[PDB]
């Protein structure tokens, strides 16, 4: 399927979501260091056999039940400093990003 990007990333605490907007990329001017998450990108996974364990997982948790993976770009080691710009570009036809 498609690799949509959004702020809502499963299995990541509210501490790492402090510096992301409604689209899923860091605010301009946020001072970053270490390995903080920069872009929230999800990669779909394949599953078509809804076993009862997966059924109860989807019942107690969200509809996806964290099936999707999280291929989110992180700050590489030894790199610090405030962000400057974000350069989102969109393919024609698809709904444009909020920013």
């Amino acid at each position: 399927g498609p690799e949509e990007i959004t702020a809502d990333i499963p299995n990541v605490g509210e501490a790492a979501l402090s510096k992301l907007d409604e689209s899923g990329i860091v605010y301009i001017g946020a001072e970053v260091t270490g390995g903080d998450i920069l872009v929230g990108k999800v990669t779909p996974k394949g599953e078509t056999q809804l076993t009862p364990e997966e059924k109860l997982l989807r019942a107690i948790f969200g509809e996806k039940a964290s099936d999707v993976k999280d291929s989110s770009l992180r700050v590489p080691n030894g790199v610090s400093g405030t962000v400057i710009d974000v350069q989102v570009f969109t393919r024609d036809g698809v709904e444009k990003d909020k920013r």
Binding site: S18, I28, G29, E31, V83
Partner: protein, 308 residues
């Protein structure tokens, strides 16, 4: 039998330049006192400097504001040279707002209660159109030495909102200081020495007060010489033994072996406690099972064991 220096004939050349004279001095003490005072004054002098700022529309230091003639990075550099004098407080906030055409200087900073701007012609930005405005909030602090913005971390205990600009702090009002040694004018004494200390600050400190501060710092440092003389940490450990919900049979066995603490049990490797009477192969598994639940496997090695 040593003459005491008296701070006399202090004269001021300009708003920054200053000359302090120490009339009575002995043979070799002039250079000693001059060097000590110069090093003390250049190293550690209290002063006020801008710590962080907040401009209305900016997000970081690497941006620009429409209508101003300088980058935000440049504006921080012109602000770093701003010198203020605060009385009775240490976290004074200096808010300035200006609109129109022409340079914006420190003279238009809002008149706070007790804050004296040494020079009011210190330009910090320029405006270039009639309808643009600049609104910033400057925070000044009091310190002792050079404190870079990057080094400090305690200021990040409470999260800084995006928009708070961090600027380095110098805190040292003394920029240049030199001393000179001449012969005193006293003729009744055979030969006497006088010392004059040319001091150039940014106008934030009084030269006499600066000399007094250096002298008291030196005296307090020397106070330590006038009387020489002188001639199991983890919370999971150190817990009561009867907290692992063991069986009745293990309770008496541990008491006989005198395992009264959790950490004593974890230090026993599997080949040696089996020799204990009536330990039980299945019961031994129970002790291993409950200790594996806490993540404490048998066979660890400690170094120091306090009684408590």
């Amino acid at each position: 039998e040593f003459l005491k220096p008296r701070l006399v004939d202090i004269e001021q050349v300009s708003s920054t330049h200053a000359k302090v004279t120490l009339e009575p001095l002995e043979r070799g003490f002039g250079h000693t006192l001059g060097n000590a005072l110069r090093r003390i004054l250049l190293s550690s002098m209290p002063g006020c400097a801008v710590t962080e700022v907040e401009i209305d529309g900016v997000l970081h230091e690497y941006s620009t504001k429409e209508g101003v003639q300088e980058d935000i990075l440049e504006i921080l550099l012109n602000l770093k040279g701003l010198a203020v004098r605060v009385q009775g407080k240490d976290e004074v906030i200096l808010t300035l707002n200006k609109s129109g055409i022409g340079p914006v200087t420190a003279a238009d900073i809002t008149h706070d209660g007790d804050v004296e701007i040494v020079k009011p012609q210190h330009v910090i930005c320029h405006l270039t159109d009639e309808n643009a405005s600049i609104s910033m909030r400057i925070k000044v602090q009091r310190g002792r030495g050079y404190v870079p913005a990057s080094t400090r971390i305690h200021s990040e205990e409470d999260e800084r909102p995006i928009g708070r600009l961090l600027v380095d702090a110098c805190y040292s009002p003394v920029e240049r200081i030199a001393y000179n040694v001449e012969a005193a004018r006293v003729e009744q004494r055979t030969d006497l020495d006088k010392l004059v200390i040319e001091m150039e600050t940014n106008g934030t400190i009084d030269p006499e007060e600066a000399i007094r501060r250096a002298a008291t710092i030196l005296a307090e440092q020397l106070e330590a010489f006038v009387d020489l003389r002188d001639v199991e940490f983890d919370p999971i450990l150190l817990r009561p033994v009867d907290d692992l919900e063991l069986t009745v049979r293990s309770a008496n066995c541990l008491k006989a072996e005198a395992i009264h603490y959790i950490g004593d049990l974890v230090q026993r490797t599997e080949v040696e406690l089996l020799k204990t009477p009536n330990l039980g192969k299945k019961s031994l598994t129970e002790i291993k099972d409950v200790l594996a639940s806490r993540g404490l496997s048998l066979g660890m090695r400690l170094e120091n064991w306090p009684p408590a």
